[PDB]
Amino acid sequence: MRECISIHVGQAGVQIGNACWELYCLEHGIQPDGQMPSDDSFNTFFSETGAGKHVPRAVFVDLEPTVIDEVRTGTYRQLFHPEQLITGKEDAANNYARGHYTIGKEIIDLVLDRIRKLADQCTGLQGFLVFHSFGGGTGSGFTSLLMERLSVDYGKKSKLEFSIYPAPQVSTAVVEPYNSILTTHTTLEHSDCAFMVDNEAIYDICRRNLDIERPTYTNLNRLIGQIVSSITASLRFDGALNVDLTEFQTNLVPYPRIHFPLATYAPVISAEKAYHEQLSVAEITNACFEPANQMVKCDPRHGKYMACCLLYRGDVVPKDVNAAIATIKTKRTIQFVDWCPTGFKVGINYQPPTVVPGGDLAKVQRAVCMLSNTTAIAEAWARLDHKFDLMYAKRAFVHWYVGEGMEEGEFSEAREDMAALEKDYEEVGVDSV
Amino acid sequence: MRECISIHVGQAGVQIGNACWELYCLEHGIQPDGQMPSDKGGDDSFNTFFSETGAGKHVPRAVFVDLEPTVIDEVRTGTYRQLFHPEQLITGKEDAANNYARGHYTIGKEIIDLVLDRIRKLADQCTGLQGFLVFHSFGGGTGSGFTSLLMERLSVDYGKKSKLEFSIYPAPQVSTAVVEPYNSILTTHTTLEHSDCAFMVDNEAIYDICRRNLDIERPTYTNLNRLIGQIVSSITASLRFDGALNVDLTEFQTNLVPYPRIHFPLATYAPVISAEKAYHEQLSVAEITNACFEPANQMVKCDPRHGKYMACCLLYRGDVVPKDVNAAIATIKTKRTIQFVDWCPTGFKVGINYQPPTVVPGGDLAKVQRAVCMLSNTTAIAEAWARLDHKFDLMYAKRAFVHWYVGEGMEEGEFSEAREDMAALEKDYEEVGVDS
Amino acid sequence: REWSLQQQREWKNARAEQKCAEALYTETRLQFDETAKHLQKLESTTRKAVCASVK
């Protein structure tokens, strides 16, 4: 009955969708042909067919055919429904105005039609999960009016938001700050919870931890898929202490303008280094608090932990969870706000994480995924504001936005809006009077 | 005992008749020779369409009327040469050639007597007549003109018999002629006063359906007429086969037509899917009943979200149960997109038939478990009529093509009178649609 | 499952037959083009021979 709808937008969204759905198929024991070789744990993600087949509850959206056609002629060509893969003809090409105004309006109708069909099939819908990237043109622009239309069409449905943030140092474009600033109204007003990750941090994690000297986007998207599976495994699988999509929003979002957590995973270690290591519950929950294992290039010792949500999988005991929390709470290194004396939410699940063939992680007995809401995000936003205002001083690249439909006042109002959003975090995290 | 007479007028009528009668013969198990191999009585389901000779042959109750021989001779030479009666294929010598005047006043009066004689013979053979089904097209000369005085004579001859009308309307943007608005205005009297229930379809919407549903990149008239035959079969299957709650012709006319001036439903069929997409979809009742309400699946180029639903008739065939029917109708009634009028609180009529639809070999559709056909009476047809009144006024502003119509026998008053009739019929729909 | 499999197998067979017919048409076209080129060459040679005889 409980089920989620995945919406993947852009090339990054489609690649993360591939790496997530391979993990889901292997987790529920479904062949690439779609048939189970043979219990309704698949019903959160897969839907039954009149031919005995399981079809995913996902919508892949893109403005170019080059990346969707690899899915269409790949290994999973039989699994996906042929009408769940929506493609345009010309991409937005690192432009917010192209993706929002001129090119998105031809496929917004088809995307909303397929979303309506899936939500009509949903007997009870937990929510939508949106996988997208800020830097790209489609993910920057089309996703904005996608969520804008979804907010009008659906009142109080959950809309979780897995987004790719630009890295502080490396980048794949030049107009990345322009495309990342203008989405901070959609991800502010028309989003319920928004986890942000950036690729340089995951590069550091895969280099230092998994002993891979040359990671690729597959080696990053597999970790992202592991995080999403550990989030949704409480819905999918029975456990000692279940947690729900509404539940961690309730226990982690204290104000409607503060919905930007940090997602960390542990343990991320190789098969050779897992052979000598005794991974206890304390030994896997201590690595989530370390700044070297964060998945955003930010340091939470500059900030204040506002809320925490822990999700444990496997041979895990609530006694040892409580002991590990007690050992965590006595560190002066980790600081909690005064207005939250009990800051933790705990979820416990029985089924251990599943290992993939050809992957980089090891077969483990227990694991943990942490969603921590802190005040160490204003530095990540100001480090991009330096770049955005430095670019916007000389009106560089701005005719490429003005001539395609949008006025120039949108730049100033988006900068002022997200500046007010930056300012609000300081009075949220300041000590009480 | 229950019987219907098929009257196919024009080239479009003859081709739709071919595609319909292939389906009927294959559904009832009748060979192209005309004999059933399965005689191992006890079966009466063919008596609606086939009359049985004591030699073992089954002859259809259809009349193929045409003013040219080039398409009737294809029927007389092809596979079904031995099935049809020799005298049920009425053909002329010179066609009307896109002229309402030629089809109505000069050429049609030569063969109208033969057509009425064969119609009299068929209706005398019929022991109880449900009605006539007239298959024709608005654009063409014969379908525009000969059908008008054929129905004028049929209204005089037969008083209260139902005359259902499957008409091909001109498409709003594409077309195959240029005097087509001139012919399509002048039949708005004979489809208003001398018809009991008129289903209008146009080719552009069926092209769109066969493009985005069946994945045929290059559809043809055979692919369109197969879908039209599926619609007529789903209408008549309640008469032909055993069902849980049967619906008769007079019954859904009563439950669809609220005023005598308003008898223009819209017909939709679901599911129209290909065999490659029948592998990835379950065709449940609640999902086949939502495809009928989608404006993209309509068979007229009109959007019913602009108008108000006045009545609906749904016909389910196959593995369908009343519990799922009621649950699906309850789901439909709660949407704010679909709007009903205030004076029709119970806006649905429901019929259920046991036997699932059949498939033709080499066809386009898939072998499905269940299906649904919807006849919805709404208000969003006035836009489709105004989109062609614009073209008629644009042409008639400076009297183009008028001498062709005047010289064959009418006067010039019929253009203005037919335009006034269409204007009144358009005003009536908005007067009905305005709420209280 | 069985019905959908049989239907798409028959559709595949029909498409293969159509492809074979189109291949036969293209081969006959190529043969006609070769014959036309040979005939043009022959006509040009005969014209040059006639002019040489006149001179």
Next chain:
Amino acid sequence: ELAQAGTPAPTKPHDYRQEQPETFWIQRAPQLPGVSNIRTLDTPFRKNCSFSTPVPLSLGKLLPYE
């Protein structure tokens, strides 16, 4: 990688254009309200009007339960 099992084998012969799909109705055909006399081996859901036709205008036909 690894081995994937093929499509499941059919237990009974299947051929479209001839075979009637199962319904609740065709499983319980002699026990339903609204089903007429069953004399056709192809489908039990074809109309038999032997009883309803009047004594005049009736050919030689077999009445139900006789």
Next chain:
Amino acid sequence: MREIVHLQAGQCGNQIGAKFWEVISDEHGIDPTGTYHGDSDLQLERINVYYNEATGGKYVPRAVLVDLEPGTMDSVRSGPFGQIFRPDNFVFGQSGAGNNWAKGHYTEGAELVDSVLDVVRKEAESCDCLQGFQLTHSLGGGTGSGMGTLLISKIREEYPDRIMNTFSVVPSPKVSDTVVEPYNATLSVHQLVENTDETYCIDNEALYDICFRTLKLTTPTYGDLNHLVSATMSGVTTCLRFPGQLNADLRKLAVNMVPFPRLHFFMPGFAPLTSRGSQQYRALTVPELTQQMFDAKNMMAACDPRHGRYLTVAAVFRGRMSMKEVDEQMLNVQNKNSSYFVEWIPNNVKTAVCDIPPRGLKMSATFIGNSTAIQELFKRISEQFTAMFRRKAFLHWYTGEGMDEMEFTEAESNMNDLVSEYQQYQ
């Protein structure tokens, strides 16, 4: 059942007429002897349209050959297909017209209409239901333009409610194969505007253009030009003798082409014509036909449609094809080009589809276009008629045969009014 009687006038009518009957005798599988040698049984379904049945399975054409001198009739009879014509259908005098309209209309051609209408009345009443007539002539001569307009006004008084087609070869702007060409061309157009239902303007300059830049022929003799004309005469009536998905006869195209009775001058075209080198560089699709069909280099008349507005347009396709792709292309050309089409007629283009393509070819199309830019043809003749007439050149060859001089001023004012009917619709 729907018969077509062919009338051939002049030496231009006889050389085009002899090549026409060579074309459709190969479509129907008729040998030079006259019998039937074919592979399909559909070729004899509608063969009574053009041929008369004789004894022993022999088919003879329903064509009458009219000329005032047997100089060209001898060359036709000595050709390959010169044995099929009935020997009683040859009508001939013994004195030529001399490229004079007065001799061919009043003096020498007035005796010869006694014998033609005995032959026309013999062939027309032998039919079951006559569709209409057909003429092939030239407006720059003495027999085609002189007597060929005397036959039109005599068979239209006898048969008023029929279809009269003309395949008239108008004079060319720079060719000028006759010194007295505009006198015969102006006095004949004045007779065509009142007595003809459809008229197809063919120019020998445009047939030179196609054989140079499209067909790439080094030596384009008149055998190839009379093939291009005869591939259009058989494409118009191909729905009369072959089945199709959507078919249109001679009358159905005239209803949908002519909005006002004076405007019946068309411009023909044929579509799949390709050079021998570029045979392998081209793909056969319906957009390939529709692109070449509307090409301004492909018209058979020396009038450019870019200088005018398309009033009505027709296309008669041949071959098995999809009705969506036919109806999509005719919409696509109308939406982009909103300046070359009139605004008070929506959907100018009419479409017809036949099923039997010509032998050895996969698809075909014939183009008939009524355009405003045909006034270019009547305005360059009216400037040459008035140039000669004010100095009264060459009148003694015309006025000396009894013709009044006010007939010349009436032929100006009927043709100077005709170019003013066309201007107001541009």
Next chain:
Amino acid sequence: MREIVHLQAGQCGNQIGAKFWEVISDEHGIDPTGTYHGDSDLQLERINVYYNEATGGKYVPRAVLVDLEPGTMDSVRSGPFGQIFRPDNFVFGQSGAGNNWAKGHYTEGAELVDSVLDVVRKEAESCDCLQGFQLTHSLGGGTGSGMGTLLISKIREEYPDRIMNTFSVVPSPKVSDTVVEPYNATLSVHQLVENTDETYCIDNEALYDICFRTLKLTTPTYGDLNHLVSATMSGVTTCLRFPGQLNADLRKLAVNMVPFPRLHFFMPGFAPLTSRGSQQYRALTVPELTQQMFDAKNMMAACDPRHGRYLTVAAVFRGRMSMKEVDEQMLNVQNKNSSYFVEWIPNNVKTAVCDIPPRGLKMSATFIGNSTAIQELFKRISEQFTAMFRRKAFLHWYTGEGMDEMEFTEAESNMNDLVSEYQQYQDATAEE
């Protein structure tokens, strides 16, 4: 679904594109006859970008060859890969231009544009969703510079919202293969700056220096030079027709390299060019590709970036490789030479990765740089133009064929305005 229509202007354009079509025909597996003889199902996935379908499995290029002297047309048609082009795509005039921009633009090149725009429209509405137009020409001739700019100014008015790429062989600083080449170059650039979306400057000095010092060849004929230019031309448009992890089209490169509409002049480079002697003495790595791309020697223009500031940089990589090392190496080269980049733009470099390398090769890369070192070329051409124009050299040829004297002065004014804009954007500071 994104077609590129190819335009060839002049003898130089005909030679360069006649090598270019051979190179990408070998890349997509096309025989000299025209059919497909390859060993992959990936080569026909995106072949409609450059080839139109024909009958019997043939593909014909979407290119047109425009010239006024049919000798180069005969040379192209008699070549090895000359039987692939459709015979109607050769548009040849009857009288030459004779190295005269006035003859190219007004007298003889004003009658050919009717036929050329007819053929361009026939090949333009034949596409489904046309991406844009490409031109190859030289600014030192009479047909490529004289009438190619007229063709640009006509087709851009016909199709406003499309993309226009140009590969221009701008004049050499030391060769001077024509006396009036600064006249032609100035009067062509004055049109290009307004009517071109992307311009790529190609220099025979740079090509000779690369083919002598890098490849170590004794006889550098124009075949090798056209091979180098065509390798750059193929490497620019690789992500359209081959799938990759991070795609990039011509529109995206224009977006990320053109900050202002008058600044659209680029310098190109190619990466792995090594000699027969040094082929075995080198390992193929991303540092060895980035070093050779960003070496100032390997530029395909005779301008040195040590005198200027890189406004924007684009890199297109080919081959199975690691995103980590790609981003690491280009961040490192951005960080090291910190004085050769502007300060008012962060992350000056755009990166793209395509999966499929060229034939016989494992990894490769292409560099496209927008810098201020291109104003050196404009300053040199302007100083030679004003060197002749005070003494009124060669001016009767241009004046007697329909040109006023104010055309040259306004060309000088526009060129000087462009170089002053480039200078101010070089000398601009962060504080304002």
Next chain:
Amino acid sequence: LPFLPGTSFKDSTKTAFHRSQTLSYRNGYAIVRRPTVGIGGD
């Protein structure tokens, strides 16, 4: 070879183009003779 607008060929090595007279007048009657000979005497 198919019968087409461009596929026609003619014999070049023909030298006699004499036109014979099959249509003439005898007494007062227009007579038509059987063409026993072609163009040039062949």
